[PDB]
Amino acid sequence: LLKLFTTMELMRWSTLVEDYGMELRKGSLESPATDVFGSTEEGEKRWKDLKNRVVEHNIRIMAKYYTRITMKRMAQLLDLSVDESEAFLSNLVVNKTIFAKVDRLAGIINFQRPKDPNNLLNDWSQKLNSLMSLVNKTTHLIAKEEMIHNLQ
Amino acid sequence: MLLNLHKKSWMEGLTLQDYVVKEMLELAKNYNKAVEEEDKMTPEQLAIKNVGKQDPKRHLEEHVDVLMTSNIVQCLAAMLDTVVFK
Amino acid sequence: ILDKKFHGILDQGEGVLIIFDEPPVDKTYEAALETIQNMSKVVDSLYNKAKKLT
Amino acid sequence: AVQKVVVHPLVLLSVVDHFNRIGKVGNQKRVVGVLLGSWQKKVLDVSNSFAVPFDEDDKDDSVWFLDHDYLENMYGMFKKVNARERIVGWYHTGPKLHKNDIAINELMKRYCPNSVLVIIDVKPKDLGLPTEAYISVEEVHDDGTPTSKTFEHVTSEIGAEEAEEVGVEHLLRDIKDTTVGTLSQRITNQVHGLKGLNSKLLDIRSYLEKVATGKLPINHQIIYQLQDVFNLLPDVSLQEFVKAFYLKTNDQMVVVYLASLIRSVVALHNLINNKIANRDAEKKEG
Distance of alpha carbon D67 from alpha carbon D74, whole angstroms: 10
| Yes or no, beta carbons of C45 and B36 under 8 Å apart | no
**Burial group, residue D278, by CB count within 10 angstroms (0-12, 13-18, 19+):** exposed
Closest partner residue to C31 (CB to CB) among D265, D272, D283 is D265
Question: What residues pair up with D37 in beta bridges, in sequence order?
Answer: D86
Residue closest to A19 by CA, chosen among A3, A6, A41: A3
Phi/psi at B33 (nearest 5 deg)?
-110, -40
Please enumerate in sequence order all residues whose Cβ is within 8 A of that of D198, keeping only pairs 6 or more positions apart, or say none. Answer: none
Prior bond to A21 cis, omega within 30? no
- Helix (H) or strand (E) segment spanning residue C54: none
- How far from chain centre, in Å, is Cα D210? 27
CB atoms closer than 10 angstroms to residue A35: 12
DSSP string, D199-229: HHHHHHHHHHHHHHHS-TT-S-THHHHHHHH
| Yes or no, beta carbons of B22 and A135 under 8 Å apart | no
Distance of alpha carbon B6 from alpha carbon D162, whole angstroms: 13
| Mode of pairing for the β-strands spanning D116-119 and D86-92 | parallel
Distance of alpha carbon D209 from alpha carbon C53, whole angstroms: 80
To one decimal place, what's the resolution in Å? 4.2
| Yes or no, beta carbons of A120 and B23 under 8 Å apart | yes
Q: Is C30 on the interface with B (CB under 8 A)?
A: yes
Phi/psi at D214 (nearest 5 deg)?
180, -155
- Which whole-number Å values give the CA distances from A94 to A89, A90, A100, A108, A122, in the listed order? 9, 6, 12, 21, 33
User: CA of A80, closest CA in chain C: separation in Å?
Assistant: 22
Distance of alpha carbon A118 from alpha carbon D267, whole angstroms: 29
- Helix (H) or strand (E) segment spanning residue D34: strand D32-37
Residue pair D181/B77 in contact (Cβ under 8 Å)? The answer is no
Closest partner residue to B33 (CB to CB) among C26, C37, C41 is C26
Please enumerate in sequence order all residues whose Cβ is within 8 A of that of D27, keeping only pairs 6 or more positions apart, or say none. Answer: none
Closest partner residue to D223 (CB to CB) among A138, A144, A151 is A144
Distance of alpha carbon B2 from alpha carbon C42, whole angstroms: 52
Closest partner residue to D283 (CB to CB) among C31, C38, C52 is C52
| Yes or no, beta carbons of A101 and C15 under 8 Å apart | yes
Please enumerate in sequence order all residues whose Cβ is within 8 A of that of D227, keeping only pairs 6 or more positions apart, or say none. Answer: none
**Burial group, residue D35, by CB count within 10 angstroms (0-12, 13-18, 19+):** buried
Distance of alpha carbon C45 from alpha carbon C26, whole angstroms: 28
Contacts 24+ apart (CB under 8 A), D173-181: D174/B3, D175/B3, D175/B6, D175/B7, D176/B7, D177/B7, D177/B11, D178/B69, D180/B69, D180/B73, D181/B68, D181/B69, D181/B72, D181/B73, D181/B76
User: CA of C21, closest CA in chain B: separation in Å?
Assistant: 17
| Yes or no, beta carbons of D255 and B72 under 8 Å apart | no
Distance of alpha carbon A34 from alpha carbon A39, whole angstroms: 5
Residue D90 DSSP SS3: strand
Q: Is D253 on the interface with C (CB under 8 A)?
A: no
User: CA of C13, closest CA in chain A: separation in Å?
Assistant: 7
DSSP string, chain A: --GGGSS--S--HHHHHHHHHSTTTSSS--HHHHHHTS-SSHHHHHHHHHHHHHHHHHHHHHTTS-SSB-HHHHHHTTTS-STTHHHHHHHHHHS--S-----SSS--B---SSS-S--HHHHIIIIIIIIHHHHHHHHHHHHHHHHHTT--
CA closest to B23 among chain A residues = A120
Distance of alpha carbon A52 from alpha carbon A109, whole angstroms: 21
Amino acid at D251: D
| Mode of pairing for the β-strands spanning D151-154 and D133-136 | antiparallel
Find chain C residues with C-beta within 8 A of B36's C-beta.
27, 30-31, 34
Question: Where does residue D219 fall: left (phi above 0), alpha (psi -120 to 50 degrees), or beta otherwise?
Answer: left
Residue pair D228/B53 in contact (Cβ under 8 Å)? The answer is no
